[PDB]
Design an enzyme around this catalytic site. Structure first.
Site, mmCIF file in Angstrom:
data_model
loop_
_atom_site.group_PDB
_atom_site.id
_atom_site.type_symbol
_atom_site.label_atom_id
_atom_site.label_comp_id
_atom_site.label_asym_id
_atom_site.label_seq_id
_atom_site.Cartn_x
_atom_site.Cartn_y
_atom_site.Cartn_z
ATOM 1 N N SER A 144 18.447 88.837 -10.478
ATOM 2 C CA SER A 144 19.787 89.480 -10.594
ATOM 3 C C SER A 144 20.561 88.950 -12.078
ATOM 4 O O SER A 144 21.794 88.820 -12.491
ATOM 5 C CB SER A 144 20.376 88.543 -9.324
ATOM 6 O OG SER A 144 20.481 89.234 -8.781
ATOM 7 N N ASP A 164 17.185 93.403 3.006
ATOM 8 C CA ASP A 164 17.133 93.266 1.966
ATOM 9 C C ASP A 164 16.624 93.955 1.653
ATOM 10 O O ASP A 164 15.578 94.430 1.478
ATOM 11 C CB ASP A 164 16.985 91.517 1.065
ATOM 12 C CG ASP A 164 17.039 92.113 -0.355
ATOM 13 O OD1 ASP A 164 17.402 92.830 -0.667
ATOM 14 O OD2 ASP A 164 16.268 90.975 -0.695
ATOM 15 N N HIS A 202 20.352 90.759 -0.271
ATOM 16 C CA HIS A 202 19.932 90.093 -1.197
ATOM 17 C C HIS A 202 20.696 88.626 -2.072
ATOM 18 O O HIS A 202 19.584 88.107 -2.785
ATOM 19 C CB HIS A 202 20.027 91.030 -1.832
ATOM 20 C CG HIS A 202 19.405 91.044 -3.324
ATOM 21 N ND1 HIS A 202 17.908 90.662 -3.094
ATOM 22 C CD2 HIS A 202 18.805 91.630 -5.085
ATOM 23 C CE1 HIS A 202 17.400 90.644 -4.471
ATOM 24 N NE2 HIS A 202 17.652 91.468 -5.327
ATOM 25 N N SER A 256 14.042 88.524 -7.083
ATOM 26 C CA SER A 256 14.435 89.903 -7.541
ATOM 27 C C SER A 256 13.510 89.837 -8.545
ATOM 28 O O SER A 256 12.336 90.289 -8.524
ATOM 29 C CB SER A 256 15.836 89.943 -7.475
ATOM 30 O OG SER A 256 16.384 91.166 -7.934
ATOM 31 N N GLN A 257 14.218 90.961 -10.007
ATOM 32 C CA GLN A 257 13.349 91.019 -10.916
ATOM 33 C C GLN A 257 12.036 90.720 -11.574
ATOM 34 O O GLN A 257 11.096 90.563 -11.684
ATOM 35 C CB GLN A 257 13.904 91.248 -12.738
ATOM 36 C CG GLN A 257 13.282 92.246 -13.365
ATOM 37 C CD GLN A 257 14.038 92.721 -14.736
ATOM 38 O OE1 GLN A 257 15.583 92.664 -14.340
ATOM 39 N NE2 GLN A 257 14.138 92.992 -15.817
#
Length: 187
Positions: free
Chosen positions: A22, A155, A168, A100-101
């Site tokens: 994020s 999510d 998320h 996340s990423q």
């Protein structure tokens, strides 16, 4: 523990290598990275080194749409850190983490590591994994019983596209369960 302990600190019995998401700032981000590091240290006090994947990993939002879900530079940086743990601290118990990423970074860096480095990785926790659907709910060529992909109800980033919802951003509530799971794999 700090955020650059593998590069700049003494060897510890447990080494947490974490890739943020994020695009939070810093090596560790702000939310679940530091939270997981802090709670691991409270369970294994003084035996934990903490290491963020950066600064070549810039956690840019647009990087989610590259072929592997992140930049090759980020994947290379993470792989270098796993290999550094192996040569600098051959007895440390490595824990991988991503949000996340940052989970895409871990999906990209871990499959190509040597058997001997994988033997040192005792568990990998992936919060809000943007690559869950793309990689079939696992890290390729890495044991599923050392992999904990944590997907909140609702999510949708775990379902193959980058649909952001409030769910998320609630992974702080999953850190206790993540660390409980890691404890079964660490001594």
């Amino acid at each position: 523990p700090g955020d650059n302990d593998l590069r700049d600190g003494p060897c510890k019995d447990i080494t947490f290598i974490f890739a943020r998401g994020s695009t939070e700032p810093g090596l560790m981000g702000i939310t679940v990275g530091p939270d997981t590091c802090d709670e691991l240290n409270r369970e294994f006090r003084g035996r934990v080194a903490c290491q963020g994947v950066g600064p070549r990993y810039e956690a840019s939002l647009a990087g989610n749409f590259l072929p592997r879900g992140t930049t090759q530079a980020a994947i290379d940086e993470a792989a270098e850190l796993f290999n550094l743990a192996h040569t600098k601290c051959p007895n440390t118990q490595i824990v991988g983490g991503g949000y996340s990423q940052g989970a895409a970074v871990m999906h990209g860096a871990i499959p190509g590591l040597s058997n001997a480095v994988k033997d040192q990785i005792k568990g990998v926790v992936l919060y809000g994994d943007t690559r869950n659907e793309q990689d079939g709910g696992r890290i390729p060529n890495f044991p599923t019983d050392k992999t904990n992909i944590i997907c909140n109800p609702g999510d949708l980033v775990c379902d193959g596209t980058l649909i952001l919802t409030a769910a998320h951003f609630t992974y702080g509530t999953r850190v206790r369960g993540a660390v409980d799971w890691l404890e079964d794999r660490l001594s």
